[PDB]
PDB file of C-alpha atoms in Angstrom:
ATOM      1  CA  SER A   1      -5.167  33.060  10.379  1.00 45.92           C
ATOM      2  CA  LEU A   2      -3.833  33.559   6.845  1.00 47.09           C
ATOM      3  CA  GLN A   3      -4.584  29.908   6.053  1.00 47.45           C
ATOM      4  CA  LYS A   4      -8.113  30.316   7.433  1.00 47.30           C
ATOM      5  CA  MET A   5      -8.663  33.378   5.231  1.00 48.57           C
ATOM      6  CA  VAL A   6      -7.520  31.498   2.114  1.00 48.28           C
ATOM      7  CA  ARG A   7      -9.855  28.567   2.823  1.00 46.00           C
ATOM      8  CA  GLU A   8     -12.726  31.007   3.512  1.00 48.42           C
ATOM      9  CA  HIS A   9     -12.198  33.696   0.854  1.00 48.69           C
ATOM     10  CA  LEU A  10     -13.618  32.197  -2.363  1.00 50.01           C
ATOM     11  CA  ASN A  11     -15.073  28.790  -1.524  1.00 46.79           C
ATOM     12  CA  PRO A  12     -18.033  29.204  -3.940  1.00 46.78           C
ATOM     13  CA  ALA A  13     -19.649  43.510  -1.214  1.00 47.48           C
ATOM     14  CA  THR A  14     -17.298  41.835   1.266  1.00 49.37           C
ATOM     15  CA  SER A  15     -14.957  40.676  -1.519  1.00 51.58           C
ATOM     16  CA  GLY A  16     -13.538  44.183  -1.890  1.00 51.81           C
ATOM     17  CA  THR A  17     -13.118  44.625   1.862  1.00 51.29           C
ATOM     18  CA  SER A  18     -11.359  41.260   2.166  1.00 50.63           C
ATOM     19  CA  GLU A  19      -9.221  42.149  -0.859  1.00 48.97           C
ATOM     20  CA  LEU A  20      -7.969  45.368   0.754  1.00 50.32           C
ATOM     21  CA  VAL A  21      -6.949  43.677   4.022  1.00 52.70           C
ATOM     22  CA  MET A  22      -4.891  40.861   2.466  1.00 52.73           C
ATOM     23  CA  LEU A  23      -2.590  43.289   0.642  1.00 50.92           C
ATOM     24  CA  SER A  24      -2.163  45.437   3.765  1.00 48.99           C
ATOM     25  CA  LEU A  25      -0.331  42.724   5.715  1.00 48.25           C
ATOM     26  CA  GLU A  26       1.683  41.395   2.760  1.00 52.29           C
ATOM     27  CA  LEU A  27       3.009  44.865   1.899  1.00 52.10           C
ATOM     28  CA  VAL A  28       4.248  45.642   5.421  1.00 52.94           C
ATOM     29  CA  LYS A  29       5.769  42.166   5.987  1.00 52.39           C
ATOM     30  CA  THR A  30       8.419  42.186   3.261  1.00 52.76           C
ATOM     31  CA  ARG A  31      11.751  42.920   5.004  1.00 50.73           C
ATOM     32  CA  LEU A  32      12.827  40.018   7.237  1.00 53.47           C
ATOM     33  CA  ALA A  33      11.022  36.993   5.723  1.00 55.14           C
ATOM     34  CA  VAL A  34      13.421  34.757   7.709  1.00 53.72           C
ATOM     35  CA  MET A  35      11.693  32.738  10.433  1.00 54.44           C
ATOM     36  CA  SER A  36      11.894  29.200   8.939  1.00 51.68           C
ATOM     37  CA  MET A  37       8.309  28.910   7.732  1.00 50.56           C
ATOM     38  CA  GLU A  38       9.103  26.164   5.159  1.00 49.16           C
ATOM     39  CA  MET A  39       5.696  26.945   3.608  1.00 50.33           C
ATOM     40  CA  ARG A  40       5.908  30.267   1.725  1.00 45.55           C
ATOM     41  CA  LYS A  41       6.962  28.960  -1.696  1.00 44.85           C
ATOM     42  CA  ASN A  42       4.367  26.154  -1.712  1.00 44.30           C
ATOM     43  CA  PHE A  43       1.213  27.825  -0.338  1.00 43.74           C
ATOM     44  CA  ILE A  44       1.390  31.626  -0.552  1.00 46.18           C
ATOM     45  CA  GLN A  45       2.275  31.938  -4.243  1.00 46.26           C
ATOM     46  CA  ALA A  46       0.900  28.719  -5.748  1.00 45.32           C
ATOM     47  CA  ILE A  47      -2.565  28.859  -4.165  1.00 48.64           C
ATOM     48  CA  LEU A  48      -3.156  32.584  -4.724  1.00 47.39           C
ATOM     49  CA  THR A  49      -2.260  32.341  -8.419  1.00 45.72           C
ATOM     50  CA  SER A  50      -4.596  29.357  -8.797  1.00 47.39           C
ATOM     51  CA  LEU A  51      -7.227  31.190  -6.733  1.00 48.94           C
ATOM     52  CA  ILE A  52      -7.325  33.956  -9.351  1.00 51.58           C
ATOM     53  CA  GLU A  53      -7.188  31.357 -12.146  1.00 52.71           C
ATOM     54  CA  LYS A  54     -10.837  30.585 -11.302  1.00 50.97           C
ATOM     55  CA  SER A  55     -11.930  34.088 -10.215  1.00 49.31           C
ATOM     56  CA  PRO A  56     -11.471  37.370 -12.140  1.00 44.26           C
ATOM     57  CA  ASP A  57      -9.190  39.769 -10.272  1.00 42.83           C
ATOM     58  CA  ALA A  58      -6.557  42.287 -11.335  1.00 40.78           C
ATOM     59  CA  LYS A  59      -5.708  44.345  -8.215  1.00 38.04           C
ATOM     60  CA  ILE A  60      -3.750  41.963  -5.970  1.00 39.11           C
ATOM     61  CA  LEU A  61      -1.899  40.800  -9.092  1.00 40.21           C
ATOM     62  CA  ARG A  62      -0.605  44.363  -9.390  1.00 40.45           C
ATOM     63  CA  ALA A  63       0.217  44.303  -5.671  1.00 43.57           C
ATOM     64  CA  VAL A  64       2.220  41.066  -5.821  1.00 43.38           C
ATOM     65  CA  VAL A  65       4.336  42.179  -8.796  1.00 43.17           C
ATOM     66  CA  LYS A  66       5.055  45.432  -6.941  1.00 42.37           C
ATOM     67  CA  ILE A  67       6.315  43.292  -4.054  1.00 40.88           C
ATOM     68  CA  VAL A  68       8.592  41.465  -6.500  1.00 38.36           C
ATOM     69  CA  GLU A  69       9.704  44.839  -7.889  1.00 37.73           C
ATOM     70  CA  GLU A  70      10.967  45.990  -4.488  1.00 37.96           C
ATOM     71  CA  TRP A  71      12.572  42.578  -3.903  1.00 37.31           C
ATOM     72  CA  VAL A  72      14.890  42.839  -6.919  1.00 36.71           C
ATOM     73  CA  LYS A  73      15.409  46.585  -6.357  1.00 36.17           C
ATOM     74  CA  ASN A  74      17.619  46.420  -3.272  1.00 36.62           C
ATOM     75  CA  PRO A  75      15.265  34.585  -0.303  1.00 38.05           C
ATOM     76  CA  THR A  76      18.084  33.357  -2.550  1.00 37.95           C
ATOM     77  CA  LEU A  77      18.101  33.257  -6.359  1.00 40.89           C
ATOM     78  CA  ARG A  78      16.617  29.742  -6.453  1.00 42.30           C
ATOM     79  CA  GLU A  79      13.392  30.817  -4.725  1.00 39.26           C
ATOM     80  CA  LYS A  80      13.026  33.846  -7.006  1.00 40.06           C
ATOM     81  CA  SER A  81      13.700  31.730 -10.105  1.00 38.65           C
ATOM     82  CA  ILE A  82      10.846  29.409  -9.111  1.00 38.27           C
ATOM     83  CA  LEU A  83       8.483  32.376  -8.734  1.00 37.70           C
ATOM     84  CA  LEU A  84       9.376  33.839 -12.143  1.00 35.88           C
ATOM     85  CA  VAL A  85       8.904  30.484 -13.901  1.00 34.99           C
ATOM     86  CA  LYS A  86       5.662  29.978 -11.959  1.00 33.30           C
ATOM     87  CA  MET A  87       3.988  33.220 -13.082  1.00 31.32           C
TER      88      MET A  87
END
């Protein structure tokens, strides 16, 4: 469902409504993050950053850095290091 949303969000009103529902699930799912997805570091971060690289947005960017803020304020260090050098 998350993949379907990404491929349907900004293919070319409802943009604000869709913006508010993406951050709702990502904020509440931040504790376990251990189910062997093998896809978080390649799709969730890389695509969303590139998605905003072609569309002006500044709200979910605040949301994602807040998620990183609670991560450091307590994945391994290698995954975090990739994210910091990515953004």
